[PDB]
Specification:
By secondary structure, the chain is mainly beta. About 0% of the residues lie in helices and about 15% in strands. A hairpin with a 5-residue loop joins strand 2 and strand 3. It comes from Dermatophagoides farinae (American house dust mite).
C-alpha cells in the first residue's frame, strides 16, 4: 500500500508508496514489517547534474544523506534530464523494533538544475500505531 506523503516531484512519478508509516499526518509506522518508503520518478527535465537531500531516521536504521553522493548518482544515475528513468527508494529490514521509535524524521528531495526532480516529506513520525 502507499501513503499520503507530500510528494513534490515534477509531476510524473510512477509510484510513491511506503510499507507502513502513514503519509501526510504524523507518519505513524508499524514494527515487525519491512517499512520501505518509495517514490520512483522519470527524469523529465534536462540536466546531467543531480543533487539530493534524503534524510530518514529510523529506530535502528538512521539513514542520512549528508552531501554523500557527488550528485544523486550514488543511488541512481547522475544525469536526469528528460531522457532517463529512476527508482530510488529506502527500505528497512524490520525485525520487531518495539513500539514507538526513539525519534523519526522522513525527508527527501531530488534536485537537478531546472527544478526539484522528486520529493517527499512525512514530517516527523511516531512508530506504534
Amino acid at each position: 500500500d502507499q501513503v499520503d506523503v507530500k510528494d513534490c516531484a515534477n509531476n510524473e512519478i510512477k509510484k510513491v508508496m511506503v510499507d507502513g508509516c502513514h503519509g501526510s499526518d504524523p507518519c505513524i509506522i508499524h514494527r515487525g514489517k519491512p517499512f520501505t518508503l518509495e517514490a520512483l520518478f522519470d527524469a523529465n527535465q534536462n540536466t546531467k547534474t543531480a543533487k539530493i537531500e534524503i534524510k530518514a531516521s529510523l529506530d535502528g536504521l538512521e539513514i542520512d544523506v549528508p552531501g554523500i553522493d557527488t550528485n544523486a548518482c550514488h543511488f541512481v544515475k547522475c544525469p536526469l534530464v528528460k531522457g532517463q528513468q529512476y527508482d530510488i527508494k529506502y527500505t528497512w529490514n524490520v525485525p520487531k523494533i518495539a513500539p514507538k521509535s526513539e525519534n523519526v524524521v522522513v525527508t527527501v528531495k531530488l534536485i537537478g538544475d531546472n527544478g526539484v526532480l522528486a520529493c517527499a516529506i512525512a514530517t516527523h513520525g511516531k512508530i506504534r500505531d
